[PDB]
Design a protein around this nucleic acid. Structure first.
Lengths: 89, 100
DNA sequence: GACCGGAAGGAAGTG
DNA sequence: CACTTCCTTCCGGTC
């Protein structure tokens, strides 16, 4: 698996709710527990040595590669970008 | 701290410092709890700068690092006491010997 | 001004 | 490459 897919995969499970959620309707999501999620991006990826600090650094390589964007000024909230997302898929 | 790399991270560096009383003037232990105090934060910061060849380094910045260690359970703030922090060896353990 | 933790991104390391 | 690692840098907020 690769990170952008993993997150979608989790979002899909919107029986989760508490730990992650769609904000807007144009690809906008917000971990309402970036800890809970950072664990899961490790449990699955094989790394309990993994945290929000490392998690978000990779979503920043997702900026240059146009795979994802940051929602300017709402906390833990990010924008999915279909442009680069498909170009990988 | 010798175990650290016999066979460079700030927390190793702090241990490196805290292992030699000659450094007492800028940092020292407070108990056998793992608590330590920066007697001279600026002089510590300076020395972390010198090491990473980053000459603009300071306590503002260094302490942001230390703050990221809270999440990795590699240390904690001594609440109230100034420039005072506490190693926790449980997090160092998971760093040297990841046990899933 | 200490202490906090978001948010950015360099830069060498990993599989 | 696809992050991972560990910061360094800047920051507004709260005490």
């Amino acid at each position: 698996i690769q990170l952008w897919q993993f997150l979608l995969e989790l979002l899909s499970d919107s029986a989760n709710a508490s730990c992650i959620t769609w904000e807007g309707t144009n690809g906008e999501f917000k971990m309402t527990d970036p800890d809970e999620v950072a664990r899961r991006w490790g449990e699955r990826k094989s790394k309990p040595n993994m945290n929000y600090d490392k998690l978000s650094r990779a979503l920043r390589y997702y900026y240059d590669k146009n795979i994802m964007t940051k929602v300017h000024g709402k906390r833990y909230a990010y924008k999915f970008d279909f442009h680069g997302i498909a170009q990988a898929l």
